[PDB]
Amino acid sequence: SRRAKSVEDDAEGHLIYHVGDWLQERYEIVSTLGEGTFGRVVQCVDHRRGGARVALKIIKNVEKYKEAARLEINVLEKINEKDPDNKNLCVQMFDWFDYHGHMCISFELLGLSTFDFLKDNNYLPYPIHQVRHMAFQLCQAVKFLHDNKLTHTDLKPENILFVNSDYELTYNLEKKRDERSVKSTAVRVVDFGSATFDHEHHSTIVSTRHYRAPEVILELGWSQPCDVWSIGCIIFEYYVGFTLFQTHDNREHLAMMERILGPIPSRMIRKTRKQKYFYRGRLDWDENTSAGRYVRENCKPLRRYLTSEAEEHHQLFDLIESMLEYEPAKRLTLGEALQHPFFARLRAE
Numbered sequence: 001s002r003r004a005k006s007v008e009d010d011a012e013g014h015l016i017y018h019v020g021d022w023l024q025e026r027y028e029i030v031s032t033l034g035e036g037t038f039g040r041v042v043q044c045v046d047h048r049r050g051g052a053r054v055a056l057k058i059i060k061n062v063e064k065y066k067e068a069a070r071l072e073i074n075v076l077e078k079i080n081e082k083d084p085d086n087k088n089l090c091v092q093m094f095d096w097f098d099y100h101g102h103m104c105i106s107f108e109l110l111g112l113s114t115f116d117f118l119k120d121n122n123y124l125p126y127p128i129h130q131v132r133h134m135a136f137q138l139c140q141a142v143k144f145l146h147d148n149k150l151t152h153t154d155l156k157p158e159n160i161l162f163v164n165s166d167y168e169l170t171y172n173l174e175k176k177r178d179e180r181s182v183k184s185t186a187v188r189v190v191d192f193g194s195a196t197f198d199h200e201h202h203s204t205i206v207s208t209r210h211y212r213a214p215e216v217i218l219e220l221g222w223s224q225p226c227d228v229w230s231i232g233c234i235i236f237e238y239y240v241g242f243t244l245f246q247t248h249d250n251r252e253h254l255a256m257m258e259r260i261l262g263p264i265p266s267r268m269i270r271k272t273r274k275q276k277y278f279y280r281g282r283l284d285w286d287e288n289t290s291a292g293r294y295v296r297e298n299c300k301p302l303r304r305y306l307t308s309e310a311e312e313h314h315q316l317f318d319l320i321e322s323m324l325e326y327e328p329a330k331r332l333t334l335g336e337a338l339q340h341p342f343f344a345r346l347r348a349e
C-alpha cells in the first residue's frame, strides 16, 4: 500500500483484493502484474477453464474508465470476430464481465512489455535483428486494425508485450561484459481503451506525449496515419534505447521536430488554430535562448543517430524517416511498411 498524494489520486476507485481471493467463484488471484490509470492487471487461475493462467484487467469503478472499458471490449470483440485464431498479433480476450461496478476483462497471459524489458536491462538498445522482428510484428498487428477501420491512438513500448520475456545472459566479447537478450521476440499489442473506429467521436488529444503526431498537436484532425507516427518513434526507441521526443510541451515538441526532421510544412502552420506557437508563418522559437540551446544540444537530425554505416541500418532509418513524415496524407501507410526493404531479411510464414 502506497501514500495518497492528492484528492484526485490514481489509487482511488480500484477493487480491493488479496492474493488468494476468488472472483465470482472462478478467478483465483495469484499476483498483481501492473497498475495503469484504468485499474490493475492481475494474474489469475481460471478454474472454469481447466485452471488456465490468465491476465485479468480489473477496471476502476469510475465512469470515465468504465466508458473506456466498454469501447475496448467492443474493439476486442471485433478483433476476435475478424481474427478467430488470434493470428494478427493483437492480444486475445477470453471473457468480460461487470463485478460490482468494476469491469473485468480476461486475456491470455503475457510477459513483460518491450519497454520494461528495456528499462530493467539498463536501456541497452535492442540489437537490429530484434528491432526488425519487433517492428515487423508491430506493423502487422496495427495494419490489421487499419484494415478494419480502427486507430489504436496510444501505441507505445509499454503496450507491446513479449509473449515470453525470458532472457539469456549472452557473452559480449567487445565490451568484456555479459548482456541480457530476450530469447523470443514474439509480441502482442495491448490496451484498446482508446482505440477509435473511423465513424466514432475522435478525441482532440490522443497518444502519450512522446508518440504524438504533429497533426494531433496542431489539432488538424487525425486518423490511421497518427499510429504510423507513433510506430516510427517506437522503432527509433528500440534502436537507441531512449525516447526520440523527450519533452512535455507543445512548443518544445514542435521545436524538437524541426531540429530532428526539418521545418514544419506551411500548410499545417497556416491551417492550425494553434497560432500561439507561430510567428510570421513559421515556428515562434528562438534557438539562441537557453530553451533553444537545450533543444539544439539534446537532439539532432534523425539520420545522425545511426550507430553504424551498414546498409541494413540505413534501411531502418529509411523506414523511420518515412513514418515521421509531417503530412499525414504523405506518411508511409502500414501496408507499404510491410513491403519495406528493411524487413526483407525475413521470409513469409
Ligand SMILES: Cc1[nH]nc2ccc(-c3cncc(OC[C@@H](N)CC(C)C)c3)cc12
Pocket: 033, 034, 035, 036, 041, 055, 057, 091, 107, 108, 109, 110, 111, 158, 159, 161, 190, 191, 192
Ligand atoms: C501482462 C499481461 N498479460 N496479458 C495482458 C493482456 C492485456 C494487458 C493490458 C491491457 N490493457 C492495458 C495494459 O497496459 C500496459 C501499460 N500501458 C500499463 C501497465 C502498468 C499495466 C495492459 C496486459 C497483459
